[PDB]
Amino acid sequence: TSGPRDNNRNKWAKKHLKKGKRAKNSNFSKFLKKK
Amino acid sequence: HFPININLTENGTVVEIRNFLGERITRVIKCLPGVTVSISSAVKDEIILEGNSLENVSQSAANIKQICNVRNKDIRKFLDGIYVSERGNIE
Amino acid sequence: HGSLGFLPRKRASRQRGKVKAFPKDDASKPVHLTAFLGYKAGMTHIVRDLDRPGSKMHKREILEAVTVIETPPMVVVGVVGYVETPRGLRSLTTVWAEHLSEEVKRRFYKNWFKSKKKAFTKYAKKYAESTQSINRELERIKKYCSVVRVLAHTQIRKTPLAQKKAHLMEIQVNGGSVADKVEWAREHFEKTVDIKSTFEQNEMIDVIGVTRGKGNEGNAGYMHRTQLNSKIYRIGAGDDAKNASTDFDATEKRITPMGGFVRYGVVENDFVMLNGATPGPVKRVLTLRKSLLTHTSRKALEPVSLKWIDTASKFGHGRFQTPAEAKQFLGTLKK
Amino acid sequence: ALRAQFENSNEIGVFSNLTNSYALVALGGSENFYSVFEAELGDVVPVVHTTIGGTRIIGRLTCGNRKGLLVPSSTTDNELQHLRNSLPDPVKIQRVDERLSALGNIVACNDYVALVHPDIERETEEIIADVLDVEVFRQTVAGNVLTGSYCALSNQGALVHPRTSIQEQDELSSLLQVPLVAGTINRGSDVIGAGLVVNDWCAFAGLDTTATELAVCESIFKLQD
Amino acid sequence: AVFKNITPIPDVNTFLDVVLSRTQRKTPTVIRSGFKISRIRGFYGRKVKFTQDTITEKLDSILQEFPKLNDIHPFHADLLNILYDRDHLKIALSQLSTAKHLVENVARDYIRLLKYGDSLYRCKQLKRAALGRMATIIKRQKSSLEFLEQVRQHLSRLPAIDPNTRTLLVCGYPNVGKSSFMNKVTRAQVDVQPYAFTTKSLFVGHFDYKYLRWQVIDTPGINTIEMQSITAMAHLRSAVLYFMDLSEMCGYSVAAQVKLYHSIKPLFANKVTILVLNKIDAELLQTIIDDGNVKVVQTSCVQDIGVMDVRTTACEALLAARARPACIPDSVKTRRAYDANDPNRRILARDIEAANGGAGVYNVELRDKYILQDPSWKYDRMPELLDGKNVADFVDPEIEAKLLALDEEEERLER
Amino acid sequence: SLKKKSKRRTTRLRSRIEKKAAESKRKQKR
Amino acid sequence: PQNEYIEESIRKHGRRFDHEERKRKKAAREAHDASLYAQKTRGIKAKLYQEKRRKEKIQMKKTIKQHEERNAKRMITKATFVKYERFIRPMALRQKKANVTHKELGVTMQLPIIGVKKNPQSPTYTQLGVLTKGTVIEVNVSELGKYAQITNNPELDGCVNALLLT
Amino acid sequence: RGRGAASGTKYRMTLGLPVQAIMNCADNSGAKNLYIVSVFGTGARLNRLPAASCGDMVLATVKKGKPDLRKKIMPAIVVRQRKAWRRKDGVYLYFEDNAGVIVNPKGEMKGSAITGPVAKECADLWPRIASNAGTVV
RNA sequence: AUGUGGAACGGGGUAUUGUAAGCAGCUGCUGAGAUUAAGCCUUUGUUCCCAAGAUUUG
RNA sequence: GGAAGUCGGCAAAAUGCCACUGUCCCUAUCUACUAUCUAGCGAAACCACAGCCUGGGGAACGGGCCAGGCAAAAUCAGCGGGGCUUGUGGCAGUCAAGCGGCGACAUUGCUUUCCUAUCAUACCGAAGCAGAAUUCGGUAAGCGUUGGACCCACUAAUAGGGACUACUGAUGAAG
RNA sequence: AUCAGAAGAAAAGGUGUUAGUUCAUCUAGACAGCAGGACGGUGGCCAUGGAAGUCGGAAUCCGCUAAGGAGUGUGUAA
C-alpha cells in the first residue's frame, strides 16, 4: 500500500490541485465574494 | 508498440510525454533554464535540445531519460525509452 | 491502546472551539471571510441521490445522518492587525465600532446586572467626537500589519437559548492586500455578515468544537477536537417556509422537527446542514472554518441534491412529519 | 455471435437483458458493457442503462419480449418510472406481485411461447398471458424448475442442459414449435440463460465461451444471414 | 510439462553465505558467561538446528521442483536423456539427497553432544565444528549444483510440447521448406537462414482449424539434433508431414531424401504420412508412393502456394484417423457493424467516456435517453412526495377530466 | 557522545587494561 | 517462448540503445566503488570483504608470480568406547569408528576402533575407554591390529582423528 | 479463493455468524447443516472470533448431510442472516434463520435450486447465485 | 439591581401507554384516560419575587 | 453465535449427541451498599537525615560524591510503579608473501517501551527476469506480525530479541 | 573522519593524505593522450552441425621487421 506520506502521492495530489479540480474552488469562493 | 507522444510548450521549455509503454500517466518535465526542446523533422521521432549552458542542457537531457524508465520489466527485452544519441554544438 | 496525539487528556481550557490555524493568505484571491460560529441544534437524517461514479450506489438513493446547526448572521464589531515578527505574530492594534450592542458587552463582565455598564464609554465617546485616532490606527494596520482579523460576535439573542453573553472571536480575512482587508473590515462595522455570504451549501468545511463531557472514567470527554472534511448539504434561510422542502418533497415545512428540537428549541434562523456527527452536545457553540488546504477528492467536488428531509418527532418515535399530515391520517380527535 | 464480459465476469445473462425491441444493461459499472451492446444494437433498439432494486443483476431479475416487460415487486417506483420513460410506447411494463421475485430465473419467454417455473401463482400466469401475449406452459427443463436460467430461448431456437434426455429435448422443441439444442457454454457452465443472451438476429456470449459452442449457437440461432 | 517453475540454484558460495547469513540474522546473538548452562546449551543448539532446517529446506526445494524422469511421459523423458544424460542428472539429483541426510546426521550428532556442554567455549566449538561440517558437506557438490543450474537454465527454455492434443509433426532434411510451412501455419517466428541446422531444437506452434486446436511441432533436420528428431517422432500421436525437395533446391539429392524417408518409415509406422512435393513450381518417388499412407501433395516452395491446401489435407487426414415470425428490423438488414477505423461507426458511450474524463469521473447522464416530447425537460426532477401522499399513485393521462367531472359534484354538495 | 558507545572507559577498564597489558608483556618474556 | 528467445530478440531487434555506455561506465567506476565500499562499510559484511580481498590479492600475486616464471552426577563427560561401570556412559558419547591417517601413506583411513590401548590421562579413563588426546588405541589394519595415537580432541571436534603409530 | 469472482465490492454490514455456528443448507444439493470453521478475509484483530454475513464466504463442514459431501471442509456462501443489518438505503433487514449455500472456490455453486428468500446483497455480488436464485428481496 | 427579567402553577404542542369510571343497548360515549421533565418545545394565561447583604479589591 | 474463553462447563443458565447459558466474541444498561464530602469522635505501625533524572565513581554502585539535565508555594482524587559475544570443524602433505625452522590465504587427501540481526508493506540492484509468479541482495523499525486442538486454516505477514517520589487527572496564591 | 580525536577482536582492506626506502624509462621524445599500422604462410594440427587466435587438447613454428602473441578480451552459428 502506498501511504499518504508518500512523496509521489503528494506529487500527484499537487497536479490534481492544478486542474479544474481547484478551479471549481477558485471561482467557487468568488460566488459569495460578489455578495 | 506504443508511440511516445511529445508536446512542446513555452517555446520548448516544457515537455509533455504521453502513451509511453501504454501508460496514461502524463510525464511532464520543465527544462532547466536556458534549455529549449524542439522536434526535428529530418530524422523521425528524435528531439533536439538547444542551449547555452552545457550543464543545464545535459541535465535536462538526463532528466528526460530518467523520467521514462521501464519498470519491473527486462532491460533485455523491454528496451523502450528515450536515449541521448548525439552530443554536439550548434556550429 | 489509545492515541498519543491527544494527550494530556485534560478538560479544554475553553468552551468555544479555538481556530488554531487559518487558511494561507493569497493576494491573487480577493477578499473573503474564513470562518463562522454556530450552535449545534441537533441532527436528523435525509435521503439523497448519490452521484458518485464507480460507487456501488451511483444514481441510487441512500440515507444520511445530518447535523443541523443554527447560525444567525454574525456582526462584525472590530478589526485587528497582526504583524509578522521573528518572535511570531503579534497583535499590533485593535479598532472597534461605535454601537456595540448589549449582547457583546455582556462578554466583558461576569456580572452584567450589578455592573455599571461602563464598557466602551470613553472609546465610543472619542469615536464620535474625534475620528482621527481611528483613522490613524487603521492607517497603521494597512501600513505595518500583515494579518488582519476582524472581531465578530454572534447574535445569541435570536437563538432559542437561555444564555445572553454573546460569543466573540477573531475571523481572519484572506484575500486581496492588507489595504483591501482593512477597507472590507471598515465597510462592515456595525453591520451583519450572513452565512450565505461565507459558505455555499456544497463546500467541505472543518468543524471545531469541544466534546461532550462524559465525566471522570483521568478526565474523559470535554476535549477540544477538530473534525475535518465535513460537507455542507443545505444552507437554509430562517425566513422561508421551504427550508426543509426539497424539489422531490414540496410539502411546505420547516427544518424544526415535530415538537421542537430536543433540549434545544425551535430553529427560526439561518441554519447549516452538515453530514454526520459533530463534536459537542446540542446548544454548544461550534466553530466552522474553510478547509486549510485544497483537496479535490471526488467527495469534495460532487454536487448534492437532497430528496427528502425528516421532521418527525425526535422526542420518542415520531411517525408524522407535519401536523397537517397527522390530522389527515389520524381520525378527527375529540378536540 | 459475440464474446463479451461484464466487468471481468462471463455471466452476461445475469448482468443484462435483451429482446427484439430493447436492451437493458447494468448501471454505474462498466459503461464498456453499454458500449458493447450499443455497438451492435444502438441504431435499431433502445439500450436502457437501468437497475432493478438497486442491483446490477437486472438480467436475472426481469423477463420480457418484443411486446412486454415484467419487473418484480422489489423494484422501486423511481426505477420503474425510469424504465417507462426510456422505453418506447409499444412496450408495456408491469409490476408482477408474484411468489418468486426473480422473474429471469423462473420465466424464459419469446414473442409467442414462454416457459415458467411450475411453482408460480395463477394470477401471475394470467397477467403473463395478458401482457406477453404468449401461451404459458408450466413445465421444467432437465428436471430443474429454473427454466429461465437453464433454457436460453429466442424466436429461432433454444438451448438447454446437455444432461436432459433426447426425448425431453424433442418434447420441449415440439411444444415450443422451434428447433432446440442441448449445448454448453463458458467451458462447462450449464447456466445457459445466465451466460447467453439472444434476440432473433443477434446473440452475446461470455468471453470464456470456446469456439465450438459459438459455432453451435450460430447454427441453431442462424445469425449468418 | 511447464518446466519454468523451478527456483534458481545458488553457486555454493552464495548458498553458504545465504544459509549462514540467515542463521546470524534470524537467531539470537548475545550471550554471557554468567548465564545458566541450560541457556547456553539451548542457545547454540538453536543455531545448529536452525542451519540444518535452512539447508534441508533449500535442498528439498531442488529435489521436489525437478521432474522425476521415471514418472513423466516418455516423450519428455526420452527428450531429456538425449539432452541431459538421465544417468548424470539422476546421479546429480541423488547426491544432493545423500547430502540432505548427511547434514541431518551431523546436526543430530552435535545437538546430542551439546547436551553435555560444561562451559561457554566447549559449546562454542561444537557449534563451530557443526557449522564447519555442513559447510564442508555442501562444498563437495560444486559440480552437482553447477550442472543442475545449467540444466535448469535450459529446461526453462524448452517448449511445453502437447502430447494429448492432436498434432502434426513435421520432419525431413534441413532447409526442405519445413520452416516456411511452420511460419505460414503457426504464429511463431522461427529464424530461416541459408545456414544448415537453423532449427536447433524443437519448435512448437498452435494452430486453429475446424474449430479445434492442433499443435505443430517442427523438429530439427537430419547427431544430437537428429536424435532429438527421432525421439520426437518415436512417441508422438501425430501425422507425418515429410517435405521432399522435388526440385532439389534444398541442396540434397532427391534419391537421398527418398532413402532417408524410407529409413525413417520404421518410425513413421502407424501414422498418416504426407508426401509433400516441396518446390514443385521450382524412380524412388514411385516406390515411396507405393506405400499409400503418404499423400502426394505438391508444394510450391518457390511460388509460396499449396501450404494452406497441405494443412487442410493434413487436418482432414488427422480427423479421419481420429407461428414464430422473427420480425428483424429493416435497419438490422443494413446495419454497419461498428468497427473503430471507419468514422461510420456511430460514436459509443465508451468514446464519450474518454473525452469526458474516463472511468470513475464521467457521470453517465441516465436521463439523456428518455423517449420524451422534449429534450429540455430532460433533466427535470419529478415530484415524488406531497403531504403524506406519493405523486406516483396519481399519474393518469386523463386525470384532468376526473378533476372536472368532480367540480360539478362538490358544487352539488355545497348547494 | 555522538557515537554508538562511551569513550570514557569505566574504571574497571582503566583497572584491567593495564594488568592485561602486564600479562601480555609477561607472555613475551616467557 | 522457445529455447533462446531473448537471444533471438537481441538478434532481430538489437540490445538497449545505451547498453554499451552503461556497461562501459560501470566498468569504469568500480575502482572508485571498491574503495568507497572498503572504507564505509562496517561489520560482518565489512569483514567478509576484508578476507575476500586478501584472497584475490594473494591469488593475483601468485598468478603474476607464475607469469615471469613463464617469461623466464556420576556420568561420563567425554567420548567412550565399548561394579566397574560406576559412572554412566551415554550412548551419545559412545564412539566406534575413527579416522586414522597413515604416516607413510598419508591417507586418512576410516577404521573401526578395535580397542583403547592406554589413556595417558589416567588408568580409569583407559579402563572406561575414555577417548582423549595422546591416548593409544589399537585398530584393525587388515584392509590397509595396529596401534595409533589420537591427533585430535574427540570431546570438542566430535570426530576421532588419529594418526597411525607406523 | 476469498472475494473471488464476486463481481463488484461489498458494503460493510453487521457480523452475524461467528466461528462455530450452525446454518441451514439453502440449496437442494443434498445437505442439511453447515458448520463454520473459518472465515475468509479476517485480519489480525486480537481475540476477535471471525464472523460471517450475507454474501460472505466461509470454510464450512456439512455437519448433517450425506457422507460424501461430509469429511471435506470447503468454502460456503452465507446467503441469509438473522442479525439485523442496515442497508445503505437505510432500511434494516433480518431473516428468520441463518442459511448458507454450498459453493466451489471459483464461485459456481454446487446446488441446483436454492430454497426461500435470498439476500439482495449476495445476489448482487454473486452472479452464479443470482443465476440459481428463486426469490430475492 | 425592573425587564421580549426570573420563578411557581396552568394551557397548547410533542410524546409513552392502550381506551378510565359511570351510563345505555360485546358494543357506543372512549386514539379515551393517565403520565409528560425531573437533562422535551412553547406560553399576551394567573400569582409572586427582585431596583440586596457580606467579603476582597490603586 | 452457543464452549470459540479458560489446563477446564469455575459460577450461574437450562428441571425443581441433543438443549441452555455474557465463560467468550464485547461488553452495555439498571438497583442497593461501600466509596467521596460534611458535623462529631479519633488510633497505631514506622521514624539517623532526607526524597527529580542520566552517566561515572575499582566494590555495592548509592539517596548525599562528581559531570550534567534542571529547578517556583499550597494542595485534592485515582494507579500503586519504585570491550565478553555472532558466518564459516579436525588430521596430514604441498606450496610460499616473507621472516627467522616456521610460514598467510589457497591445493590435495575421509568423515508498556526499546533493538534491527526486516516476516509483511515502500523503494532499490542483480538473475534465462518473456508476462505473471519467484529467488538473492541493499536502504529501511513509519507501520502490522491472527484465530483454534508440532499441527490447520485465515492473513499482506503471522520476524527474531532486550528491559516519600514518580504517573494520571483536578484546584491554586503571586508578581 | 555522514557520528574524528583528546592490551580485545588486530590479521588484513582503503582510486584517503604526507613523507621516506629500493628498482625503472626519459629531447635516440619519458607517462598519457591521440592518428596509423597491429601483417602475410594459416581457417597450422586433432577436435564439429557450426570453432577461422578468442566452445574445446599439445605445441604454438616461421618471411618482412619498427611490430604484429597458432592470440588480450568483447563478439559472430561460423
UniProtKB/Swiss-Prot annotation, chain A:
Its main location: nucleus. Keywords: Nucleus. One of its GO terms (cellular component) is nucleolus. The keyword Nucleus applies. Residues 25-35 have a biased composition (Low complexity). It is found in: Nucleus, Nucleolus. Disulfide bonds: none annotated. Residues 11-24 have a biased composition (Basic residues). One of its GO terms (biological process) is assembly of large subunit precursor of preribosome. It comes from the Eukaryota. Belongs to the UPF0642 family. This is UPF0642 protein C32H8.05. The chain holds residues 83 to 117 of 117 of the full protein.
Curated annotation (Swiss-Prot), chain B:
It is found in: Cytoplasm; Nucleus. It comes from the Eukaryota. There are 2 genes for uL6 in S.pombe. Component of the large ribosomal subunit (LSU). Mature yeast ribosomes consist of a small (40S) and a large (60S) subunit. The 40S small subunit contains 1 molecule of ribosomal RNA (18S rRNA) and at least 33 different proteins. The large 60S subunit contains 3 rRNA molecules (25S, 5.8S and 5S rRNA) and at least 46 different proteins. uL6 lines the binding pocket for eukaryotic elongation factor 2 (eEF2). Component of the ribosome, a large ribonucleoprotein complex responsible for the synthesis of proteins in the cell. The small ribosomal subunit (SSU) binds messenger RNAs (mRNAs) and translates the encoded message by selecting cognate aminoacyl-transfer RNA (tRNA) molecules. The large subunit (LSU) contains the ribosomal catalytic site termed the peptidyl transferase center (PTC), which catalyzes the formation of peptide bonds, thereby polymerizing the amino acids delivered by tRNAs into a polypeptide chain. Belongs to the universal ribosomal protein uL6 family. This is Large ribosomal subunit protein uL6A. The lineage of its organism: Eukaryota, Fungi, Dikarya, Ascomycota, Taphrinomycotina. The chain holds residues 96 to 186 of 190 of the full protein.
Curated annotation (Swiss-Prot), chain C:
One of its GO terms (cellular component) is preribosome. Gene3D superfamilies: 3.30.1430.10, Ribosomal protein L3, domain 3, Translation factors. Residues 1-24 are annotated as: Disordered. GO terms for molecular function: RNA binding; structural constituent of ribosome. The modification Phosphoserine is found at residues 3, 55, 130, 133, 197, 245, 305. InterPro entries: L3_arc_euk (IPR045077), Ribosomal_L3_dom_3_arc_sf (IPR044892), Ribosomal_uL3 (IPR000597), Ribosomal_uL3_CS (IPR019926), Transl_B-barrel_sf (IPR009000). Its main location: cytoplasm. Disulfide bonds: none annotated. The keyword Mitochondrion does not apply. There are 2 genes for uL3 in S.pombe. Component of the ribosome, a large ribonucleoprotein complex responsible for the synthesis of proteins in the cell. The small ribosomal subunit (SSU) binds messenger RNAs (mRNAs) and translates the encoded message by selecting cognate aminoacyl-transfer RNA (tRNA) molecules. The large subunit (LSU) contains the ribosomal catalytic site termed the peptidyl transferase center (PTC), which catalyzes the formation of peptide bonds, thereby polymerizing the amino acids delivered by tRNAs into a polypeptide chain. This is Large ribosomal subunit protein uL3A. It comes from Schizosaccharomyces pombe (strain 972 / ATCC 24843) (Fission yeast).
Curated annotation (Swiss-Prot), chain E:
Keywords: GTP-binding, Nucleotide-binding, Nucleus, Phosphoprotein, Ribosome biogenesis. GO terms for molecular function: GTP binding; GTPase activity; RNA binding. GO terms for biological process: assembly of large subunit precursor of preribosome; ribosomal large subunit biogenesis; ribosomal subunit export from nucleus. Coiled coil: none annotated. It comes from the Eukaryota. GO terms for cellular component: mitotic spindle; nucleolus; preribosome. Its main location: nucleus. It is found in: Nucleus, Nucleolus. Transmembrane segments: none annotated. Residues 166-319 form the OBG-type G domain. GTP binds at residues 172-179, 218-222, 278-281. Involved in the biogenesis of the 60S ribosomal subunit. Belongs to the TRAFAC class OBG-HflX-like GTPase superfamily. OBG GTPase family. NOG subfamily. This is Probable nucleolar GTP-binding protein 1. It comes from Schizosaccharomyces pombe (strain 972 / ATCC 24843) (Fission yeast). The chain holds residues 4 to 465 of 642 of the full protein.
